[model samples]
Target chain A: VKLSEDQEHYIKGVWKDVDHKQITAKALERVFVVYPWTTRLFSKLQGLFSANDIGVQQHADKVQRALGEAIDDLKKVEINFQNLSGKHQEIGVDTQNFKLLGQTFMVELALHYKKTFRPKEHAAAYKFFRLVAEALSSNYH
Target chain B: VLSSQNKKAIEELGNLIKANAEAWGADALARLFELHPQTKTYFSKFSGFEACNEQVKKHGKRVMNALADATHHLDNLHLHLEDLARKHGENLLVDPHNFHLFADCIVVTLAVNLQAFTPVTHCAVDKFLELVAYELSSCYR
Candidate 1:
């Protein structure tokens, strides 16, 4: 989705992780920095939390923290997702590659989520992210 | 036909899956409907459910196939969907919404047979459910 330079930089800002063993809040911070403008990745990461069984409380915390960094439409919708469940739950993580303009972008990221979902609720979650992505795209979304 | 409980169960199954799997599901749905003959006009080719389960089996397997290939590079999901959906759109002369029914069938099926043992499946499944809402919301468009 051809990001603007600002968006590009904002996204690139998150790639600044520390060297080695584990990712720190600082590393997570860099990753989270561009989060607002990157809902798909954020959602994917949040999904990772689910896969890993990180639990709703902590998962929401990381997601909330990520949202706090960018302060964008994506974050607002994430709140909706959390509120829908209205509880903390664990998540999962995985590395995936995505394409943007025919160019592949590798995100050793995650897509953690689960099997049990209210049918309509699932639809709502999708709508929420899409709306947020649109809002960010329009400069407020 | 599925019972009421099964209805919801099947619905959830349809909700999980994106990118290649979504398209495959569409093809499978197309196969099922095609057998009826009267519904053939809804599509010009293999699309939007009601095709053949054999075709369904053939393409539906692409779910993880594409997911695997896209792993570490998942951003292109909708873009990839764009290509496949558009192909169906142009060929079938139906809008993306037409896939909704097919989408529903896929999710319901998935939900019924659903089980979560891994982090990726756990998370991807839920987010995939969320995707249903995401696509349905485009109804306003």
Candidate 2:
């Protein structure tokens, strides 16, 4: 979806005000608590990705930085998005589960952002994240 | 051979390094250069590292982050292990003895940072690094 100047401003402003590290940590914890199965794929990804492990906090720090970078380079973000999908090719993934992953991340964003994260902003984000999910799962199809 | 408990300890130590990658990495490398001055000969071609503390810290961060990556995938280290080993062997022409010295530097850094780093952690990290050193040093032959 094409974001108008106002929509883009609102979205970027909200993200700018956010503490990505805190949001990511809470979201990751929520991911494990709600969907334990996500741990299966992550089992191969040790260090920061280890579920319920102390490393998750460290990983959250890295995740926030990447997210921040992706936000600024909106035009270039798609390439980064596609590159990540290519990396996941080594591990293999399912398209359906890919959408689930997007949903999972979105829920955490919604929870953390609260009222500032209303349906209008979310609609814009959903399109953006849809691009990410589609790029990631494109290999499966 | 490292016991499972030792492996866990080393893993914990690695996570600690990741927590403050820049500072810890710099400390380890600073100690390495101080303890083994000859190690600087290889970096003599590089204008940054030997010229300033920041440059040294930058390179040191890379070194520690690499260690963190290797520890992350210790179970399947063979994936990138040979390439890493080959690079150090071919590019640096480093002596096998130096590997053990680097390991000592890392352990010293860990000792200062990790409160729970007793003999158990020390032995585990040392043994693990010894194997890594042997593997990298042997790639030349």
Candidate 3:
């Protein structure tokens, strides 16, 4: 879907408001922490997506459904995170971890989203996110 | 070798980062930078997504896409892991304190979205923030 001017403007405005330095640094630090954990965790969960004899379409559908769930759950978690971040002062987000867990439920659900979806696997990411942003801006439940 | 539990935790962390960061985008990163002007140099080449990609070692404009791909179905963080790990992993310069800064930015961003979360959510996120530091630094120790 095409983003309305309001949507684009709001997103851009938010981006504009924050200084680039802070975001990049914090995110990098977050990366140092999050990346290794991701590698370790993803390998174990790999087998869950595979079944003895699931057909392509059936499996793809399953992944798509899971992706949807992942996106939805993340929306809730993301909003919560934004809230906690707003309350920050030099430190905060033990609160962030709770919301991160909430979001993990969705990511876990969509574990096979990329492998499962066909025709346009890349589209899933965009769709998953656009919906979430729309939700952020009062899109839906 | 890491246990499956730790591995699962790793994947969970990766997915959480992917889902939440995906929801927010460079703008969130940009906002984060805004709050931490001291971090300006790391992101000099980037006005947006490129800055994010550079730090994470994904080396692409598709910072969001790479993250989403890495965590979407629990993809291996190994490739990305080594890349990012090089920057801060096991390094004495790595700051445990920055996690607090991360918490600070993340909390503020989440607060922007009201009606979708609660105080409980904030607490949850706080937990994840702590976990992020531990999980990524696991190899360090």
Candidate 4:
């Protein structure tokens, strides 16, 4: 579960160039497509297409930035994600949906960086996502 | 991804697992909560927090029974676990990471109580559980 220094650097480096809003929007869009039940939480995002809707993009930006901050402060994951977890819980978000988002986020990364996102990076990113999922779900009861 | 040998080994241990389902399941849950206190929040509604608690025992037994059923339908695990995956992911809102944590504790419980659990069986069981975790987490997508 430990990300070596090089792996962390690699992730941060790749993340720095990513279109955070677009990628997360797509990930969120994929979630809705795959699990329509999740759309119940975002009634404002109904009938959106291609995740290009302003509301989707705004939420995506928030998600991506929160993830970036989490990566920046990996050592204090539980502390960093505590508030976000509580907020999600308050909004009636199922903790399990975090895994769905993480999975789609990885998929978007792979699609965008087909060659650079090799097996090693994929493994590292997968581990990182799991860590994030763990932190984001820490407050569930 | 269970190989034939892994499936066979798991089947061999199936009846033993079923016979001791209640005891083993509760013991595994106890070990999980003891080792990872963060997971205890999910059981906040239980009448008592201890392993011997009635609600804990009932839940643990249900978990073990599900695994026993899984063994009988390894080839069709996706179908066998579809409803369960949805129930955990949607209704129960379980953190998918807990599946792996619980699997680890299940292995520890088996190791402690079963003299027949050799290294080979251990390997098989590990793979089997990995597959189980994958199927159980499928609903998240």
Better of 2 and 3 by DockQ: 3
Every model's TM-score on chain B: 0.41, 0.86, 0.52, 0.94
Enumerate residue pairs that collide in model 2: none
Task: State the TM-score, rounded to 2 decimals, of chain A in model 3.
Answer: 0.26
Q: What DockQ do you compute for every candidate structure?
A: 0.04, 0.01, 0.04, 0.11
Residue ranges of candidate 3 with Cα displaced over 4 Å: A1-141, B1-23, B47-87, B90-96, B138-141
TM-scores of all candidate predictions against the true structure: 0.28, 0.47, 0.33, 0.58
Candidates, ranked, lDDT = 4, 2, 3, 1
- Comparing 2 with 3 on TM-score, the higher-scoring candidate is 2
Show the lowest summed lDDT stretch of 10 residues, model 3 chain B.
B113-122
**RMSD, model 1, all Cα superposed?**
17.2
What order do candidates take by DockQ, descending?
A: 4, 3, 1, 2
Q: lDDT tens digits, residues B1-141, model 1?
A: 223443343334334444346444544344335322344555345443332445444556664344334332234445544544444545544545444444333433343234532322323433443453343344333
Docking class of 4: incorrect
Selected candidate, larger TM-score, 1 vs 4: 4
> Residue by residue across B1-141, what tens digits does model 2's lDDT show?
666776777677678777778877776676666545788787775554331378777888888788877777667666657888889888878887888867755655554555544333444676678778877886777
lDDT of 2 by residue, A12-107 (tens): 786777776766665565455434555566664453443345667776787677667666765566567666666677666555655544544555
Off by over 4 Å in 1: A1-141, B1-53, B62-72, B116-141
Question: What is the Cα-based lDDT of residue A44 in candidate 3?
Answer: 34
Please give the distance, in angstroms, between residue B138's alpha carbon in candidate 1 and its true position after superposition.
8.9
For candidate 4, list the clashing residue pairs, or say none. Answer: none
